[PDB]
Each structure stands twice: as C-alpha cells, then as structure tokens.
Amino acid sequence: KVFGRCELAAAMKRHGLDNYRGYSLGNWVCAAKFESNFNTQATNRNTDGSTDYGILQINSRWWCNDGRTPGSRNLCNIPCSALLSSDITASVNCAKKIVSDGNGMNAWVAWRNRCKGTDVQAWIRGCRL
Numbered sequence: 056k057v058f059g060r061c062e063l064a065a066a067m068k069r070h071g072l073d074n075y076r077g078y079s080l081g082n083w084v085c086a087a088k089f090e091s092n093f094n095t096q097a098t099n100r101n102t103d104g105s106t107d108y109g110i111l112q113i114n115s116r117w118w119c120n121d122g123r124t125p126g127s128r129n130l131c132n133i134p135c136s137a138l139l140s141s142d143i144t145a146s147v148n149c150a151k152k153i154v155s156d157g158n159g160m161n162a163w164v165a166w167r168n169r170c171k172g173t174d175v176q177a178w179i180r181g182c183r184l
C-alpha cells in the first residue's frame with residue numbers, strides 16, 4: 056500500500072510515534088517519505104547482504120529475520136515480511152526499538168541525510184491530526 060502523506064501521519068501518531076524519544080511526527084513522516092516513498096512494500100538490498108524492509112526500511116542485519124543475512128540478529132523478533140504489511144503496526148514497534156538503541160533516528164540514513172535539521176513540520180501540514 057502506498058500511503059498518502061496525512062494517512063501515514065495519522066497512522067504513525069496513533070501508533071505513538073509522535074514525539075517518541077523526542078522525534079516529532081514530521082521526522083517520522085519525512086523519514087518514511089525518503090526511505091520508502093510511503094510504500095509499505097519497499098525492499099532494498101544492501102551491499103553487505105542485508106535487506107531493508109518496509110515503510111521505514113528496517114534492516115535485516117539487526118532487526119528482523121529474513122533468513123538470508125548470515126550472522127544477523129533479529130532484535131525485534133519478527134520476520135522481515137511482517138514489516139511489509141499494509142498495517143504499519145509492526146514497523147512502528149520495531150522503529151521504537153531501533154530509535155532507542157543508542158543513535159536515535161540516525162539509524163535511518165535517509166533521515167540523517169535528508170530530514171535531520173530541516174523543517175520537518177512541513178510534512179504534517181494540512182493533516183487533520
């Protein structure tokens with residue numbers, strides 16, 4: 056499913072991402088926009104052999120199990136396919152775990168390079184939130 060900007064903003068807020076670990080909702084919408092283009096089915100292979108899954112491109116080296124990343128952890132205890140559902144619940148629970156692991160949202164390269172320090176509030180503009 057390709058979310059609309061405000062549809063994803065409302066889903067993320069309902070799942071408690073608004074202000075989680077101090078990151079305002081616009082940060083999460085911006086991160087998803089540039090990580091997956093709001094596409095829950097986005098998958099992207101890394102050169103180290105891990106894969107990024109879902110709307111927030113969660114990596115299989117550390118967070119989910121996809122069975123093809125030798126030496127990988129599954130700290131969110133979840134199949135990576137569960138991060139692709141039209142329901143973003145699982146991706147959000149795992150992102151909460153990720154952002155609390157030590158480097159915050161710098162875990163998302165697109166967030167660090169494209170969202171960090173910018174006017175992320177623009178991303179929730181117009182949403183009936």
Ligand SMILES: CC(=O)N[C@@H]1[C@@H](O)[C@H](O[C@@H]2O[C@H](CO)[C@@H](O[C@@H]3O[C@H](CO)[C@@H](O)[C@H](O)[C@H]3NC(C)=O)[C@H](O)[C@H]2NC(C)=O)[C@@H](CO)O[C@H]1O
Nearest residue numbers: 107111112113114115116117118153156157158162163164
């Ligand atoms: C959204 C996503 O999946 N992003 C991936 C990143 O999570 C990943 O970065 C590496 O993540 C692990 C887990 O967060 C980092 O480990 C932690 O390191 C810090 C110190 O920097 C320490 O506090 C923690 O103890 C330690 N946790 C564990 C469980 O060991 C690791 O350092 C991150 N690497 C870098 C370069 O920042 C990267 C790389 O796999 O991929 C993203 O896609």
Ligand code: NA
Nearest residue numbers: 119120127128
């Ligand atoms: Na794994």
